[PDB]
Amino acid sequence: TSLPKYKPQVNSSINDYICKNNLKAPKIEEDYTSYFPKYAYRNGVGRPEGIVVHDTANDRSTINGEISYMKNNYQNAFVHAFVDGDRIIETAPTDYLSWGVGAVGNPRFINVEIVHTHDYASFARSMNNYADYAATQLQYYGLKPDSAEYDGNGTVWTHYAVSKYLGGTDHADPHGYLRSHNYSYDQLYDLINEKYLIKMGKVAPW
């Protein structure tokens, strides 16, 4: 008796495209900085409670440019990783917090930024890449996917949901950005869930 194929819970032609074409996320590359702070989550080092979906709100920057700026501006903001259509770059260890979502969410969640992309295929790859990175973290930390968007409880959050339910911040990403590419947070969450289940050996790989 073989593993079942995951049945999508959120209709998504983009996720259908990603799956049908067996898109492979790239390696997770480190690019750490010696002077970034190494602060515990509220429950300890190595104790994130979930992960946040952000987007850069910048329609012109590249992943390299975002990282260069952040290395100089980390006292204002920094995040754990960036993804684009080509790369997944982890800029801070997930065992310590990052300064990406305000004083309430930072002690709880891994912060990951989606760099803006400018064609259909690269956007799709960037969603696959976010989802693969997120599912990797959830599996590594033993955190089952649970979306917080509509109840303020779970392991996968948007910046918007942190603003809405937790406070400490007032940003609304990533909903408007994903909508502009004919996608949605719930489509992304469904992809994260599928990849988590693949990594857990519960559903069939692509």
Interface with Zn ion (CB under 5 A), residue from 50, 54, 89, 189: 54
Q: Whole-number minimum distance, CB 179 to Zn ion, in Å? A: 15
Q: Give 30's strand partners.
A: 90
Q: Whole-number minimum distance, CB 192 to Zn ion, in Å? A: 17
Assess 171 for contact with Zn ion (CB under 5 A). yes
Q: From Na ion, Zn ion, none, which one binds at residue 171 (CB under 5 to 8 Å depending on kind)?
A: Zn ion
Q: Whole-number minimum distance, CB 118 to Zn ion, in Å? A: 20
Q: Whole-number minimum distance, CB 204 to Zn ion, in Å? A: 33
102: left (phi over 0), alpha (psi -120 to 50) or beta: left
Assess 146 for contact with Na ion (CB under 5 A). yes
148/178 with CB nearer Na ion: 148
9/153 with CB nearer Na ion: 153
Q: Of 112, 103, 92, give the one whose Cα is nearest residue 50.
A: 112
What are the tokens at 161?
A: 């949901």
Assess 173 for contact with Zn ion (CB under 5 A). yes
Distance, CA of 180 to CA of 153 (rounded, Å): 27
Q: From Na ion, Zn ion, none, which one binds at residue 68 (CB under 5 to 8 Å depending on kind)?
A: none
Structure-token match 């909903």, residue found? 175
In the three-class reduction of DSSP (H, G, I as helix; E, B as strand; rest coil), residue 30 is classed as strand
Could you tell me whether strands 81-83 and 88-90 are parallel, antiparallel, or unpaired per DSSP bridges?
antiparallel
Type of residue at 25: A
Assess 108 for contact with Zn ion (CB under 5 A). no
Type of residue at 60: R
Q: Whole-number minimum distance, CB 51 to Zn ion, in Å? A: 12
Whether 94 contacts 110, CB under 8 Å: yes
Whether 167 contacts 102, CB under 8 Å: yes
88/191 with CB nearer Na ion: 191
Assess 151 for contact with Na ion (CB under 5 A). yes
Assess 153 for contact with Na ion (CB under 5 A). yes
The residues of the shown chain that bind Zn ion, judged by CB under 5 A, are 54, 159, 171, 173
